[PDB]
Amino acid sequence: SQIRQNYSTEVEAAVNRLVNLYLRASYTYLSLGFYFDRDDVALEGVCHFFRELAEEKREGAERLLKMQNQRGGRALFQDLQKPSQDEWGTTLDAMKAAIVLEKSLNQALLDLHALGSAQADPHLCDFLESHFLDEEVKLIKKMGDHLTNIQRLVGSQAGLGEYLFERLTL
Amino acid sequence: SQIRQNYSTEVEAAVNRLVNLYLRASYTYLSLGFYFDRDDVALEGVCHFFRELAEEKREGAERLLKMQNQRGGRALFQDLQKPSQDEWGTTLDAMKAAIVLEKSLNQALLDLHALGSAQADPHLCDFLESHFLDEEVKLIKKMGDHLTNIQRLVGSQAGLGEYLFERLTL
Amino acid sequence: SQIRQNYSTEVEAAVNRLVNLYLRASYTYLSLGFYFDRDDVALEGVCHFFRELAEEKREGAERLLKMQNQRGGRALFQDLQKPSQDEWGTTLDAMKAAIVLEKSLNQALLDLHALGSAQADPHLCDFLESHFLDEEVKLIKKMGDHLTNIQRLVGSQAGLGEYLFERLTL
Amino acid sequence: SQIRQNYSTEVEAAVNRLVNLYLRASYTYLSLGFYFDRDDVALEGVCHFFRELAEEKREGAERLLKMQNQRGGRALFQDLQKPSQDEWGTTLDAMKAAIVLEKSLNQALLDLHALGSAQADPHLCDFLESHFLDEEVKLIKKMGDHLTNIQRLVGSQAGLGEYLFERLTL
Ligand SMILES: [Fe+3]
Ligand SMILES: [Fe+3]
Ligand SMILES: [Fe+3]
Ligand SMILES: [Fe+3]
User: Fold this and answer.
1) CATH homologous superfamily, domain B1-170
2) Does the N terminus or the C terminus of chain B have fewer Cβ atoms within 10 A?
3) Cβ–Cβ of C2/A40 closer than 8 Å?
4) Where is this region: Catalytic site for iron oxidation (chains A, B, C, D)?
């Protein structure tokens, strides 16, 4: 590649794997959101929450793919593993699942940072720090807030608390 | 009739019976809504829900009657059977009743479709598919959502959940 | 399911497979568009073409998923097969590939129509006819137009014609 | 200097040399742009391209000079070497030259990053990452796009392709 400069094949491969990870999370959020749209689940607010996460993680991957081209790497696409569940239980269960998912993207984001730093790629480090590293911390905090408030409500009246959280928070 | 063309007497009779069915549902929703307006029931939100269903099913019948004239059939009017109940119990009971009612209009709508199709009346099929078939599926889904959320709330605090649903959903 | 009515398990399974097909096409268009964004390919116009197809087929699948819930079926998600190619050659090759892809969705759409009709599901037939059947014919025609104009331009000056089409048509 | 803090003489000297490098590139772009304004060259679009690069690299150096003062270093000015050519040939040749030039600023930018990092100057690293590191990658990508499109057009009709690129891209 004529434009390629200071872009290592170790990093380019990582970005490709991270594109795959973001798309699979976006796929998971798609499943999550449409499950709460079920007539036997019927939690409007929870569905819109996970559908916007699906979009956000999709724009995240499109951002990586664009950066891949700006640096002179070749995007390579793999199969998208299906979501780990077909039914996600309650809001508390869904939220729990989401937080583990975000914590594993964040893990992947940090490893890719440590990689690009050992490779002395300051532009990659700057790209992850602005568009990704901080959004991921804000989101996990916001998700943790939700977990604490759901666990409070589910406490005695499980069915009532799920309704109140969806109406009054989401 | 001079304008009549490809309009069978089997179908024309069906439309007349379906006019009668829609009017009787609109009558039922009228009863339902004014029952929740009772001082000993006093659920503003539930009353407005059923009154708008009463109007919607009334416009539905006026639509059939107009189509009847556009095709060259003769509208014939029968007695409107009174609603099956004088008192409708709780929101959960009312909703249950409504869903059975909508499911029987939808049944009538599908039979009238199957009839007009066997008669090779493509215009009737198109008329039911746009103005009726899809509204009826949306509505039953929306009603099912309500049932799931009421059943969640009525769970432990029956009286409290009825209030919250009416204030926070309707 | 309480809301389910006139919805067969044969059809519900088809919709799920068609959700999968639309997502995999949307995945393909994602690959196609980002390939033309390559510095060694550099055809802005062709990239934006395929990226909007990626979105459109994604909204298409979200539409099916929403309809699945409105009818009382359960959405089930499978793995997304990766795109058939990693590099797509020229505009003429990409366009050729796209048309075969659209022609196979359209095939899937027609089979699902024939299925829902034999099952006497008039609402499914109406849903495919408005939101899908006509968009798919318009698109294939528009794609065929592009093929004829590319084949004209690639005729003598392959490299020049690709530039002119991208600047003057896309 | 009273305000100086965590600012090493190795780095301050680098910034001064990089000021000189940016000014000499801005000088080169000045030559490039006014050459395409020649009546025997007459490529309006190519001239405006290189003149805006001349400004941009000039603002870049003024930015370094301002940062030098904010940190407490002393700006020292050297002679500006004249451009390497007096006549730059075709658009393809000019573009080739530009890309090598940008790739050598980017090289200088990365070395100055590696230097300030080994010196543990996090503010310098942040200054290069926001105002310079990313602009330089975007630009080289954009320049590579241009090279691919020129090489496509120059293919058979060299004189015609130069005109079309200038009219339809620049
Ligand atoms: Fe690297
Ligand atoms: Fe008929
Ligand atoms: Fe069916
Ligand atoms: Fe320093």
Assistant:
1) Ferritin, core subunit, four-helix bundle (1.20.1260.10)
2) N
3) yes
4) 52-59
